[PDB]
Design a binder for this molecule. Structure first.
Ligand SMILES: NC(=O)c1ccc[n+]([C@@H]2O[C@H](COP(=O)([O-])OP(=O)(O)OC[C@H]3O[C@@H](n4cnc5c(N)ncnc54)[C@H](OP(=O)(O)O)[C@@H]3O)[C@@H](O)[C@H]2O)c1
Ligand SMILES: NC(=O)c1ccc[n+]([C@@H]2O[C@H](COP(=O)([O-])OP(=O)(O)OC[C@H]3O[C@@H](n4cnc5c(N)ncnc54)[C@H](OP(=O)(O)O)[C@@H]3O)[C@@H](O)[C@H]2O)c1
Ligand SMILES: CN1[C@@H]2CC[C@H]1C[C@H](O)C2
Ligand SMILES: CN1[C@@H]2CC[C@H]1C[C@H](O)C2
Lengths: 259, 259
């Protein structure tokens, strides 16, 4: 791969059937990477494959329920074989939200969000490690959230899963440095995705989202490609001195207090 | 309680038979609070009760394995009845550590640390909510760590549990503000406890600990009472405007880069 592209790089992006994950798959592939993705719907994935391949992108995808430990192991096995045991990039993007106040969460809600948002990202990273190392130039990017550092209504537990992810990001940057793997996190602010489309369905959640956008310096939602651009950069050989960082792509939301 | 004391306040401190928790019990009690504590060792708890009571402290304790959901429920029931349904203070101090690199953790390891370090704290907070609210002046203090914010050898997963705790702390401060409950976190640096004594039994870990001490401005470990002082203060009616904060009692560790 050249200084500003990913020509010849292999990548695995979790949850790439829509939203941010979809934009990340497009960005990485358009920059020359060979991409592999997953989601829980085969039909959806196949329609994504048809669009991507129509653009000349090298992409492959298979169904995987990241909430399942055995399914994750199966996914990594499949990917390793598909890439010949060499994986340059791992983007832990899949995630879900359960809008409830902390005390209204059930054991099932908690277990589900924790397994998909944090455990899956942690598990998959460890599973990918030998292939990232074998690649000799590995990159692990976690997709966090501003909600992992600051209070947002109905995101106490969702925020906790991201807070755990952020700390894991910092530590892995040090534990895997000798393996030539850089590890960073990208925290999106409000990005127009299906998750957001379903959110504004609720009038209260719609109003809560409007607050966020207004606390943005740019006062507008970001686009998946605006988030994907940062993820792509961190993978470029050009970003070789960047590691252990959690970068926010939020239109200035994190820098705000009274605006 | 006056502005600088806890006369008449009721409190629950988890893991108060040793180290920081022990120090917190003694501090709160010496300031007038009626305290209830727990741990997994009945014999140790009885020795403690004798020590504290002979000093005139109002303390009570029962054995409880915080890694168990049912035991946590049982604990809350007993404390609520012991305090007649009114709990002013809850200090989530109990925690353990497993010193393995992220990729060497077993599922058992991960489940254990996450259940005691984060789940127990989250669950206990929710169980205590009605009683904290009933007290008319509640305080919840989470004992975090500098490790929940920055990388420390063998504390990738441990740090993740604290990072989750820190975010939960910030959110609960907002969700429970209307119930007149303040929520804060206190992150200790290196405090002389049994956990620390066991740790330095291993030469490599002893050297890693010396790196931390050498990196704090005061260049020495703190004592349990030094950490306890900050916990007691946040509970004082004097700290009525402090909430949603994570304060570090670390001899300056968190402010250092090149010293
Ligand atoms: N949109 C925002 O404003 C925003 C802000 C901050 C952070 N984020 C983070 O960005 C990431 C993506 O969010 P998004 O808004 O793009 O969401 P989205 O539009 O709902 O897309 C999520 C993607 O992840 C997949 N996925 C979810 N659970 C999965 C599972 N258990 N197994 C396999 N695939 C799974 C979904 O596919 P299936 O449902 O078909 O399986 C989908 O492809 C998340 O980690 C989210 O926390 C988003
Ligand atoms: N010491 C430091 O330098 C330091 C630094 C940063 C953060 N911390 C945090 O401070 C807190 C206390 O640390 P410490 O150094 O005081 O530890 P410690 O000396 O090992 O004391 C921990 C206390 O919690 C109890 N405990 C542990 N697991 C329990 C369980 N599953 N159920 C019931 N009780 C349990 C222990 O009793 P049993 O084992 O007998 O049950 C003990 O009474 C922890 O959250 C730790 O993460 C400590
Ligand atoms: C309302 N929230 C904002 C945008 C979408 C949803 C989840 C995210 O982490 C932050
Ligand atoms: C070595 N670590 C330092 C001190 C004790 C153990 C846990 C803690 O959170 C930080």
């Amino acid at each position: 791969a050249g200084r500003w592209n990913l020509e010849g790089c292999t990548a695995l992006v979790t949850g790439g059937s829509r939203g941010i994950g979809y934009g990340i798959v497009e960005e990485l592939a358009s920059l020359g990477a060979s991409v592999y993705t997953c989601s829980r719907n085969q039909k959806e994935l196949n329609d994504c494959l048809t669009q991507w391949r129509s653009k000349g992108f090298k992409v492959e995808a298979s169904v995987c329920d990241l909430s399942s430990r055995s399914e994750r192991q199966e996914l990594m096995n499949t990917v390793a074989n598909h890439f010949h045991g060499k994986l340059n990039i791992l983007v832990n993007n899949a995630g879900i939200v359960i809008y409830k106040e902390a005390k209204d969460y059930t054991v099932e809600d908690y277990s589900l969000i924790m397994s998909i948002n944090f455990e899956a990202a942690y598990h998959l990273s460890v599973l990918a490690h030998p292939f990232l190392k074998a690649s000799e130039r590995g990159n692990v990017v976690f997709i966090s959230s501003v909600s992992g550092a600051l209070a947002v209504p109905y995101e106490a537990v969702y925020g906790a899963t991201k807070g755990a992810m952020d700390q894991l990001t910092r530590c892995l940057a040090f534990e895997w440095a000798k393996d030539n793997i850089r590890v960073n996190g990208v925290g999106p602010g409000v990005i127009a995705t299906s998750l957001v489309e379903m959110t504004i369905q609720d009038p209260e959640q719609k109003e809560n989202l409007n607050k966020l956008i207004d606390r943005c310096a740019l006062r507008r939602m970001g686009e998946p490609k605006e988030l994907a651009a940062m993820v792509a950069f961190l993978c470029f050989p050009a970003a070789s001195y960047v590691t252990g960082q959690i970068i926010y792509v939020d239109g200035g939301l994190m820098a705000n207090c009274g605006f």
